[PDB]
Amino acid sequence: SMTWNFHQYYTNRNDGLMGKLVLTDEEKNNLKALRKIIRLRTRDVFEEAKGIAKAVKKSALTFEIIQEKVSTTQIKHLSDSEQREVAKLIYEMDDDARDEFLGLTPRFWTQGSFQYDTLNRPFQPGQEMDIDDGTYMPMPIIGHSLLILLVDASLKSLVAENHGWKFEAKQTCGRIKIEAEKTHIDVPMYAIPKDEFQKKQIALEANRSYELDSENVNLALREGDRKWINSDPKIVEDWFNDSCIRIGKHLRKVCRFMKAWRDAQWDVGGPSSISLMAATVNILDSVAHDASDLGETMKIIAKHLPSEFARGVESPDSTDEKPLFPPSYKHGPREMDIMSKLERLPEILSSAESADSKSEALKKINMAFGNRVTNSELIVLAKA
Template sequence: MVWNFHQYYANRSDGLIGKLRLDEAHTTSLKRLRSLVRSRIKDVFDEAKTIARMCERNNFTFESVKIEVSKSLLRYLTPETQTEITRLLSTMDEKARKSFISLNPRFRTQGSFQYDTLNKPYVTPPQEMDIDDGTYLPMELFDERPVIGHRLLILLVDSALLSLVAENNNWKFTPKRTCARLQIPQHNTHIDVPMYAVPADQFKQKEAALKAQLSFSDSYININELLTGRESQYQLDSNSVNLAVREGEEKWIKSDPKIVEDWFNESCIRIGKHLRSLCRFMKSWRDVQWSDGGPSSIALMTATVNVLDSYPHDKSDMDSAMRLLVEKLPVEFTSGIKSPDPTSDSFLFPPSHQHGVDEIDVMGKLDLLKVTINSAYKALTKSEALDMMSQMFGAWVTNSELIIAKQATPAFTNEPTLTAKPKRISPTMSSG
């Protein structure tokens, strides 16, 4: 017997896609957490700006500023760091202080939550859903670097997350090289907050243009949720997006997450909407095979795009598309997976001559995936086929009746086509 797994993958209630997707209540809960973090960051910046205004007066003292810090949300920093931020606020030069007082954070989600490829975690803990929510700071730049101090901005975001940790049991704050992380175990979630400095003049021009396009009521709703409701219309020069980093000599690096987002969205248009589902399936495989670690999500997504761009397949048949994918992925990973961001020359997964223990493990499990899928295709019974699939993708699917006998028909229900040749991403692609 030969089996077809289209419904195993594609059934929206009992199939793999139905089990991996977050339901509306879960999505709403994550958005509520994201809004809580955004609101707290705004509150911290507002309090810090109030203190900075106080420092404009000639009669302020270091101790008076320190007292104000201790009464604000900045009090959740360590005593040593409170002293540090007091010094940073009280010693800003006039230009930096003026820029800081006019600063209003904006926010933009990136990563799998934005791409619509976020899966439920399989093993909890340690697996968690990852919400990447960038804090964008439109400010004056000098020699392409922000005039406001890097350390001050880092500490303000840290203060916001630390205050939430103090108010919520079991929440945890972790500083990372390129972000601040808030872990929320009750929701099997962490929220990463990278911080970007962007040119205020560019941002204000685009803000004014968008306001002019909106009706009054629409403007009131959306302009106050900039880079959220209409984030795709806030496109900035990628070369002007500066990511704050905690380690190394460089405090700001050019890094625009919108480049990869645009690449993936264009890939979905070119290849088809099934691309998102196939990426979800491969991420599910990764989460089952490694409770922690394994190939990165962006490496799996890039390899999947490369395969589907290169080989004809029936977009309406998840079974044949997945068999094609698992057949070709080992070759992709052997060759190495390059970043789709043309501003980066790094590999997301190295070529075979650079493989170490971890990479060899990945290659072995990719080969096992290929063998297991082919074996399930020819299993003696539906139950046996389902067991094999569960070994690869987890025990999400329990209804073996979704696996049906393959009819003696041509391999494709529609004439297979090769997707349009992908365009190279321009290094000047804009961000939002």
């Protein structure tokens, strides 16, 4: 019958899918403002704690005195038991550890889709704009417990100052959720080598008006036997940025489209954003496609994703042994459900391509991406 071209459906920045997914400048700035609020408080809470440690160093303080001091700082927004732990930890530092703590100032680096520009406007109720802002502690080679308590104190002190904010503890981060604004901010915490951080910060400021060795970037884990895991988020940022330069400007677009497909097919759940990115990069690295037709390119991606996910999707961090998505012999109900929807996507896109009219084509492709694009005039007859 007829054959439709969907390039403008995907890419029109006003009415097309990109126009629906990309945050406005006002919205990006609001997330930047939120990140800055978290950073300022975290630096302030660390200074208050260091102020207490400095008093302990300057003169012998009893545990009860340290407890009272803790209780007058913004650490007061922790629970009473947690405040005791913070006081105990500060009191029990030996002279050497205390000197290291007095020298600590947290540093920050954003990771995830806010950093490499693939953050989509959320679609279904419950979905939220996500800022992943890592907090970094330069140390040699100071306790895991203390560092987690102080970041928790910072986040809880902000929650105590804002109606509708909620703190959530997760295995790999602290989170502040702002449900009414469809926004949350995740704060993973890292330990990094102090000597190397300093040396490279100096070098960086000298070249202006290097990167930390990935092996020593340690992500704090909240529960279990392992308190730390080596996981440098910049590995993913660098791998994705290089992939964009290598594959082209359309990579960021089709990764957004696959994430939006995911958001439309599951209110919560579905394949991780990073697993979609990795599979998509693999396909586009190994299959001929045409960037001037993202409708065609999306068809090619959809055809190949099931097999990518079936063989298992490995992390761009080769030091990470966990797959982003397990191979099919390891699939349980959750993975089988993801395979099912992945297998459906090509069928949906095919149905759209051979619809009898523009409005029918729009309806069919919106089975994949939701009723977000409404302008059927973005869909046009394919050229002879």
